[PDB]
Structure formats: structure tokens, C-alpha cells
Amino acid sequence: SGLVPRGSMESGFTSKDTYLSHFNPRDYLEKYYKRHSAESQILKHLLKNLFKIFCLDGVKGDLLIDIGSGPTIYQLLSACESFKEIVVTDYSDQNLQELEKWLKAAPAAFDWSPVVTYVCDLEGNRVKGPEKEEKLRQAVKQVLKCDVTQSQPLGAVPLPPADCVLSTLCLDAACPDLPTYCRALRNLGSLLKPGGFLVIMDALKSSYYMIGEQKFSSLPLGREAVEAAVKEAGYTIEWFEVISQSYSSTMANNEGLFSLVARKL
Template sequence: MNKEKFGREDYLKYFDPVAFLKMYHSDIKGNQDEGDLMPWKMKNLHDVFAEGKLTGRRLLDIGTGPTIHSVISASNYCDTVYLSDFTPQNRETLRKWLDGSLQHSFKSFFQYVVDKEGKGTSPSCREEELRKKICGILPIDLLLEEPLAPCYFPRFDMVTTSFCLDAVALDHVDYGLAAQKITNMLKIGGHLVVCGLHGSCGFKVGEHVFRSCHVSVEQVKDTWTRCGFDIVDWREQESDKTRRNTVSTFDGVFVMVAKRVR
């Protein structure tokens, strides 16, 4: 897959939520070119929250995109959820999901989660439970001194982010700067859950290629440790190098749970 030069304006001009959802979120299987990335991600997000150690009143999801799959499991362990994204088109897509007017269905994701939770809840009821916990869909820019400006919030009890820093940062230095902004939004003693890619170069949405930050596992762990976190859980899966992947490039996917200690 050929790389294209990254620019902030790329996401504003070219990121198509409809194409993204069709390519990567048609169902729980995800994009077949990426192997079992999506099922692996959903399983491990469920598992880290199901242990019951991650709880809090207020949760912020950073870089939600046009999809809500990454907060489904987390929503059982907090009272309120705030979603956020850089692009207006993604925030509008989230608003359509919230008011029930979005044409895209996340039913298979909710079905997967309720099956895992084993409480006999229907996917539609679980989706409504999540909707009731959403307290805001916020603009966010991790390159600003105050990423949520003009909104200001007390520090959150939990922060989650999925495949966001890979897209925001140009290199591991930028990755560290963005990580520090995220750190400042979380309470000391609060927990951070990051789902990310290591060794990533880019991904396609429609015909447009967006570059990703190429960081190693060591760089990711070192960044968050320097930001004042203890990494309490790390789950990783390497990509299948024998598979022909035409939509994205990465060496592996990880889910990290970390506690802010300073």
C-alpha cells in the first residue's frame, strides 16, 4: 500500500464516515483483509473491563471516530460517557447514532458484547443503555494546549482511546506530546485504556490513504511510563504476515491498561 503525505486537513477534507463504516465496521468480523483484528479487539476490551478493576463515574473516549464499538464494554463500568472526535463529519455521525437516525447498524457488535456478558440482555436494549449514558459528543484536538477547548471539564475517572494516537502523531515524539495531553485529562489514580497498532504505516478509507505513526511496542510503553503511568495490563497480537492486507499496514495490535500514578 502506497503511503501519502499526512496532513491535518486530510481528515477534514477526505475522511468519509460512510466509507469507513462500510470498510471496517459492517459487522463484528471487521475487514477480512485485516484478519481477526476486530474480534480480537472486542474480546480484549470486554475482558479488561469484565475483571471489574476499572470503574469510575465519568469516562472520556478520545478520537471515537464515527463508531461506538470501543465503548460498549466500558459503558457498564461508569455512570456517564463522553465521546470526542476531531472531525465534524464523525461527530455528526455519532449524533445520528445517538438520535437513532444513522442508517448503519452496530447490532453485531452489541450482540457480541451481550453474549460475552451473559446476562440475557438483547442487543437493542444494550444499545439503548449506552445511549442513555452519553452526556456529550465533543470536538477534540490533541495538538491544542487545551484539547477540549472551548469546553472545560474536571479530570476524568477513566479515559479510553482506540486507534487515535496512531493517526494524530507524525512520529514517536508527537506521540509523546499527544499522550501528555491525554494524561492531563485523567485523574491521578484513574485508569487509561489504549487500543493501538504498533509498526503501523497507514490505512485506507475509500480510495484515500491516511498515514499512521510508526511506533514500536517499546516506544509506546516508554511514552506512557514517562507520562506517569504504571502499565498494569498489556495484551498484544502480531499481524498475520502471510495475509495480503490491502487496506492497512501494521506489525501488531495491542490493548494497554495503565493507572496514572503521578
């Protein structure tokens, strides 16, 4: 069936258990992070932006919790230069397994070398590709289970309050409505130190995203709804950027991406 995304017939939005069953890390990785495609340009945009946030701006500290990491590590590459400890998390178990293969530098794991090299050229080439992946691997401390829709996102796992909370291309997929988007930001706040940083980068006006022929739901947010929901979840925006570049017609109906850096009140 392709009339409605998988797991959305009864409710209207993809169910969380749909991510445990029909989400495949290998195809998600090959589809978006594997010539100079729409996806390659988007990745270059999120990387250049993460380089500005973590290396040019004042976003440094001890703990950075990454929420809904999937099987990806592109989003951590520049943060490992400013954060002493990273905690990668996700709801889908198979994604945490794909991340644990990467921490182990297993041969079965996905090859992030083109992305690592690109980030090294962004950072002025102080180090090479292999030295960079090793610094990130050491910085990743725990691999955790995650549910944004819970007052305690990481269950009973006792973690010190974080200096920053990163969340790339996840909240739109996780939150079925605006109240859930608001409640989920407040829950991420339960991990943040007072005045701690909230970093999000996600699609704009997208009702879906594809994994081959697997349609997955996305909350079609507008720039103003993002600004409004963030402010109302107990945060103050510092920086808000919107680029008009979209994913390929065949994989998503987004009308650009957004990226913000908010601070918890």
C-alpha cells in the first residue's frame, strides 16, 4: 500500500512500532548518506551548519546528548571538538546496533569516509580522516534507548545534565501533532542544564519521507510553527536559519530545511 505511509492507517501518522519493524538502517543510509544529488547538497548544508555551531560559535561543554540518531554519525563529527562526552540515542534497536557496529569499527559497518574527509576540509585540515573518526568514537560514551514522547526520554538511565541536546531530522518523524512536538521539546529539557543549548535541524512542510518504497510520516511544519512551538516549550531562540533546498521529488515533499539554536529557560 502506498496511499498512506506505513503505520498510519488507523491513527493518521506512522506508529512508533513501525520504526522497530519496517525501518531499515542499511537502506536509510544508502538512500540519504551514501553523484552531486539533492541529498548530497542537503548533507553538505547540515555539515557546514554543524561546523559553524560547534567550531565558530560558543557551543562547547562536557555532555552532548544526541536524540534520535538513527544509524548516522555525520551530525556528531564537529561536536566532538567542543564536547568531551557524547551520548547517542534512538527508539529503533536496529539503528543502535548499526551505531554499535560503527563504534567497533566493524567491516560490516557503513563507510562514513567521504563525510569524515569533507568535515576535515571544513575544519581547515588540522587532522586527516582516520584521526577524526577515532576522536568521535572515543567521545561517544553511551548508546541509549530513546522515546521523546516520554517525560523521561532515556528511561531510568541516570545521566548528568547535558550542556547541549542535538536532534537532526528526527522530531518531524517522531511527533504526530503540534502538542506532541511541544511536549517532546519540554521532555528534552529534562536532560538540559539551566541555560543549556537546544539544536535542531529538520524538514519544512513535509508530510512524508521515503526509505525505498516505504512511506514514513513527517509533521508538515511551517517556519512559524517551529519558532512558536520552540518558544512555548520553555526555550528562547538565538539563531534560526531556513534554506529553500529540498530533497528529491521521489523521496520527500519538504519545501526546504530549518536549523535553530535555542537556549533553555
